[PDB]
Amino acid sequence: CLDLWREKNDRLVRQAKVAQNSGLTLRRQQLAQDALEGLRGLLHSLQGLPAAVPVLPLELTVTCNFIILRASLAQGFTEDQAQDIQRSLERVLETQEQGLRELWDSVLRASCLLPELLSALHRL
Amino acid sequence: ISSQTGKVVSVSGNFSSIQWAGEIENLGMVLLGLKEDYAIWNTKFCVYSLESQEVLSDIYIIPPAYSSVVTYVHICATEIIKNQLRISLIALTRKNQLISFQNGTPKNVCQLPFGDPCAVQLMDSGGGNLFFVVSFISNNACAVWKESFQVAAKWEKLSLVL
Numbered sequence: 001c002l003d004l005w006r007e008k009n010d011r012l013v014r015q016a017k018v019a020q021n022s023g024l025t026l027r028r029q030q031l032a033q034d035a036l037e038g039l040r041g042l043l044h045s046l047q048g049l050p051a052a053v054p055v056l057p058l059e060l061t062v063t064c065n066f067i068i069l070r071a072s073l074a075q076g077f078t079e080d081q082a083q084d085i086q087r088s089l090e091r092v093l094e095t096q097e098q099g100l101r102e103l104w105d106s107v108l109r110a111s112c113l114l115p116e117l118l119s120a121l122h123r124l
Numbered sequence: 125i126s127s128q129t130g131k132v133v134s135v136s137g138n139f140s141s142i143q144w145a146g147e148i149e150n151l152g153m154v155l156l157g158l159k160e161d162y163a164i165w166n167t168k169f170c171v172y173s174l175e176s177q178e179v180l181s182d183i184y185i186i187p188p189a190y191s192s193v194v195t196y197v198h199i200c201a202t203e204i205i206k207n208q209l210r211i212s213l214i215a216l217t218r219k220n221q222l223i224s225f226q227n228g229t230p231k232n233v234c235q236l237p238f239g240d241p242c243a244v245q246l247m248d249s250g251g252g253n254l255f256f257v258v259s260f261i262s263n264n265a266c267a268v269w270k271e272s273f274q275v276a277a278k279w280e281k282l283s284l285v286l
Contacts, residue, residue: 001164052189
């Protein structure tokens with residue numbers, strides 16, 4: 001289950017990097033927006049589950065990757081990404097509302113509880 | 125109660141929900157249900173014989189994590205490579221998802237446009253096309269593709285659909 005999601009993630013990263021190091025303007029974007037839709041699907045797939053403790057490091061990782069790739073293709077940022085962050089932190093809290101400031105405050109208190117996903121969280 | 129029986133039988137097994145039911149090859153009458161963590165084989169979700177026979181499968185239905193969210197089930201195909209069984213089954217969920225399963229392996233999830241679906245059916249409609257038509261409690265309905273779990277038509281109104 002989780003192994004399948006992980007392995008899809010990895011497949012998609014590799015696809016991304018293959019297009020990145022090689023490829024021309026069209027084939028690059030083709031493989032990219034492929035991987036991108038895969039990651040959308042995988043995000044949604046993971047957002048279908050109640051967020052057990054053992055899943056989160058993958059959830060955060062994927063959303064991070066999604067954000068990065070989205071933004072790099074768009075060549076700019078948006079607010080949908082900030083919304084995705086709010087959603088991921090909402091998830092972290094449901095494990096254990098107001099605004100980005102208080103969310104972050106409560107998240108970082110919930111992380112100095114030491115569930116070990118800080119190598120993703122700090123990236124987020 | 126059957127006509128073939130005429131008798132009010134009680135179900136011996138203590139189920140919570142009975143998301144699907146119907147006949148299967150070699151098994152006869154059947155209920156999908158449950159009794160009361162990412163391992164496919166664990167599943168938490170009892171198949172049932174109907175008229176008090178063995179559970180008959182607890183092997184390759186949905187993982188127990190999903191078992192909290194899913195609100196409807198509709199079986200698409202059942203093979204026997206042995207005493208066990210292999211089902212391709214569609215579920216759909218509180219979070220407005222339609223999910224496929226194969227030996228309990230979640231593949232091909234789709235995210236529905238509208239909210240709180242109630243039922244889902246399958247449309248043949250021509251050469252190699254196939255639609256899952258989903259209804260909701262909001263008196264609306266979508267039709268999602270097969271082979272690429274996505275949306276193809278979206279509608280609201282509709283006291284009934286056939």
